[PDB]
């Protein structure tokens, strides 16, 4: 195959995606408290059983 | 606090059977300080190049100033 194809576009999309800066957000509990936060979220007060248990449903 | 102790039959008995750094910690021996370890070694090695007393070599090196 060809080897000397163009290089002008090196970085095209990364350099033209609009930068939407991150958003400041509540600090997450780093440690056992997170495993606890997973426990009560997953098993204690379970949110929905709409057929099955969705773990990241946006527009359901 | 769990430690270890010695009690000697006399104070003379201690100042000979005791480590010389413990008598420093107490006061029963003045810390006679000397030049650094790697200074004494260099002194020894410098000393090893002179066969004899040496001050006889100071006379012949006084002849150097003439020539």
């Amino acid at each position: 195959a060809k080897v000397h194809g163009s290089l002008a576009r090196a970085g095209k999309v990364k350099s033209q995606t609009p930068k939407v800066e991150k958003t400041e957000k509540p600090k997450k509990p780093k440690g056992r408290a997170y495993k606890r936060l997973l426990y009560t979220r997953r098993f204690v007060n379970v949110t929905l059983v709409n057929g099955k248990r969705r773990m990241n449903p946006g527009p359901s | 606090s769990v430690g270890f102790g010695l009690v000697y039959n006399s104070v003379a008995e201690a100042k000979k059977f005791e480590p010389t750094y413990r008598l420093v910690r107490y006061g029963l021996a003045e810390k006679v300080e000397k030049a650094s370890r790697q200074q004494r070694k260099q002194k020894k090695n410098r000393d090893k190049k002179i066969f004899g007393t040496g001050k006889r070599l100071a006379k012949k090196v006084a002849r150097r100033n003439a020539d």
């Binding site: 195959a1 080897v3 194809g5 163009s6 290089l7 090196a10 970085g11 999309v13 | -």
Partner: protein, 144 residues
């Protein structure tokens, strides 16, 4: 019994046959011929640092259709020339021929990776500053 001598004193025949048939084992063959030392641009090592000659637009294989950004590298310990990939969109702006990159295996036991034809190596660092770091923003490329 189909072949293998079941006799109680046939150990030599059984050892030697194994010895002989190990050679059909692809890995056993390379390990004893020292192929990594003989062949294989890297001297048998995990990485190898080299120097960039020219920047190549290797065109991907089918059914893909792209231009995969790569650099021809002349390994220091070897002088062997090797064309290696520069991953991660961008990153061909970091290399700048005559530079000193650190190559690494591509993770297919030789065997060029994907649609990239005949590229068995990828860049990990340039100018000693960690391609990944340059990509994000963590480090900056050195003076020259």
């Amino acid at each position: 019994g189909k072949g293998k001598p079941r006799g109680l004193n046939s150990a030599r025949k059984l050892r030697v046959h194994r010895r002989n048939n190990r050679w059909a084992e692809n890995n056993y063959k390379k390990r004893l011929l020292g192929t990594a030392f003989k062949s294989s641009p890297f001297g048998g090592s995990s990485h190898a640092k080299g120097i960039v000659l020219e920047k190549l637009g290797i065109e991907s294989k089918q059914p893909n259709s792209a231009i995969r950004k790569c650099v021809r590298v002349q390994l220091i310990k070897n002088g062997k020339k090797v064309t290696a990939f520069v991953p991660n969109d961008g990153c061909l702006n970091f290399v700048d021929e005559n530079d000193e990159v650190l190559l690494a295996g591509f993770g297919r036991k030789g065997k060029a990776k994907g649609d990239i034809p005949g590229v068995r190596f990828k860049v990990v660092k340039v100018s000693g500053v960690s391609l990944l770091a340059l990509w994000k923003e963590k480090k900056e490329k050195p003076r020259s």
